[PDB]
């Protein structure tokens, strides 16, 4: 294990981590590729889905969160986010231009997450 994976696991958020997330979290709802996940899914725009998806997440909700001091540890956060794209991937085809944002978007997350923990670690 890691440094940066232990901190993940076992190391409490604190006010200047949640700093550093409110930023992971803007660039995310900023990216050209976020549109579909800014806000919940509207049943209209799928009437089958939350009969589909158990763990609806969109990046308002996690806003929401965020602001709260919802999350612990950066697992929980890490988790919620990833929530978004699973559900997307799940429920669409691959050629949904959902399904498209949602691979760009977790790849850029991806590379905002690993700034965020090498940021915490020094
Ligand atoms: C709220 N609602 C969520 C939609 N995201 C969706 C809709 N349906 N399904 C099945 C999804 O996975 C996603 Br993500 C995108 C939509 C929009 C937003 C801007 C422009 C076009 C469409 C705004």
Same mark, same amino acid.
């Given at each position: 294990?890691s440094?940066?994976?232990?901190?993940?696991?076992?190391?409490?958020?604190?006010?200047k981590?949640?700093?550093?997330?409110?930023?992971?979290?803007?660039?995310?709802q900023?990216?050209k590729m976020?549109?579909?996940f800014l806000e919940?899914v509207?049943?209209?725009?799928?009437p089958?889905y939350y009969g589909?998806?158990?763990?609806?997440?969109d990046?308002?909700?996690?806003?929401?969160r965020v +602001?709260?001091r919802?999350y612990?540890?950066?697992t929980?956060?890490v988790?919620?986010?990833?929530?978004?794209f699973?559900?997307?991937?799940?429920?669409?085809?691959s050629?949904?231009?959902?399904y +498209?944002?949602?691979?760009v978007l977790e790849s850029f997350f991806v +590379?905002?997450l690993?700034?965020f923990?090498?940021?915490?670690?020094?």
């Amino acid at each position: 294990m890691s440094t940066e994976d232990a901190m993940t696991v076992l190391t409490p958020l604190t006010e200047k981590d949640y700093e550093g997330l409110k930023r992971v979290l803007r660039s995310l709802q900023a990216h050209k590729m976020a549109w579909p996940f800014l806000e919940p899914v509207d049943p209209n725009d799928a009437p089958d889905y939350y009969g589909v998806i158990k763990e609806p997440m969109d990046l308002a909700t996690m806003e929401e969160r965020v +602001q709260r001091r919802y999350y612990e540890k950066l697992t929980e956060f890490v988790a919620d986010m990833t929530k978004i794209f699973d559900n997307c991937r799940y429920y669409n085809p691959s050629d949904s231009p959902f399904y +498209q944002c949602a691979e760009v978007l977790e790849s850029f997350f991806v +590379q905002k997450l690993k700034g965020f923990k090498a940021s915490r670690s020094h």
